[model samples]
Target: VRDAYIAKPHNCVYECARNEYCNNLCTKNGAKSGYCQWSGKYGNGCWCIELPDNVPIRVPGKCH
Candidate 1:
């Protein structure tokens, strides 16, 4: 079967890689991509975080 992967939305990956909280949550869930959102209440939240796109979901990943 073909591998299933996920990629960050345009220009979002940089934000994910730079945010400490987002990056930490991403690593915990083995996320490759994450949604970028800014809010005064939550600051930056990384939802649907996962590992590299080359890595298949079967391996491990999450989506919001």
Candidate 2:
């Protein structure tokens, strides 16, 4: 399966303070696995695979 970025409409990986925190958040939210992407379009975002259908995708920071 493909991966997807995790985020909220008003927050970017809310409370993505550390890798552990990020992973915990995603897993609890129904992600099989996840990691903190420290530097990227969404900035300290969560990249997760096997995410739940309800999870929101991070908005692109450099795309059109």
Candidate 3:
């Protein structure tokens, strides 16, 4: 399994104000779900669960 992080679309710079919002974004990109996590460099963003690496999903921005 491989894990990754993707920043929210439309609004970058970590704006995952709600868990639902984060999860929604994550699921769209083929992730199981997502949660809010604070990054010292990127601020708050959504961290996705481990996903199979076979599916070709668009890489959002950068994984945390």
Candidate 4:
């Protein structure tokens, strides 16, 4: 079963909390246009997911 997780601005922030891996992994290729994906084929390890262009996503937050 594929668990769907729509990438959003808040979701990015929420996922980035504490776990930098989640944030870095997700935005590794950059989130200018946003990205979506799933990690751990057999639940081996927790990681970010890469999605297609049409996938829902939000721009990464910036702090001044």
CA lDDT of each candidate?
0.40, 0.69, 0.59, 0.37
Candidate 4 has which clashing residue pairs, if any? 36-50, 36-51, 37-49, 37-50, 38-49
- TM-score, every prediction: 0.29, 0.65, 0.54, 0.24
lDDT of each residue in 3-64, candidate 3, tens digit only = 65554343353456677876776777678887766663456766667645763332545433
RMSD, one per candidate, in order: 10.8, 3.7, 5.3, 12.0
Instruction: Let me know the TM-score candidate 2 reaches against the reference structure.
Output: 0.65
Candidate 3 positional error at 55, Å: 8.6
- Residues 1-64, candidate 2, lDDT per residue (tens digit)? 3466777655455536577776787788788887878786665677787888867766646322
Evaluate residue 16 in candidate 3 and report its C-alpha lDDT on the 0 to 100 scale. 64
Better of 2 and 4 by lDDT: 2
- Ten contiguous residues with the weakest lDDT in model 2: 8-17
Q: Is candidate 2 or candidate 3 better by TM-score?
A: 2
Q: Which candidate number maximizes TM-score? A: 2
Query: Residue 3 CA error for candidate 3 (Å)?
Result: 1.9
Q: List the residue pairs that clash in candidate 2.
A: none
List the candidates ranked by lDDT, beginning with the highest: 2, 3, 1, 4
The order of the candidates by TM-score, greatest first, is 2, 3, 1, 4
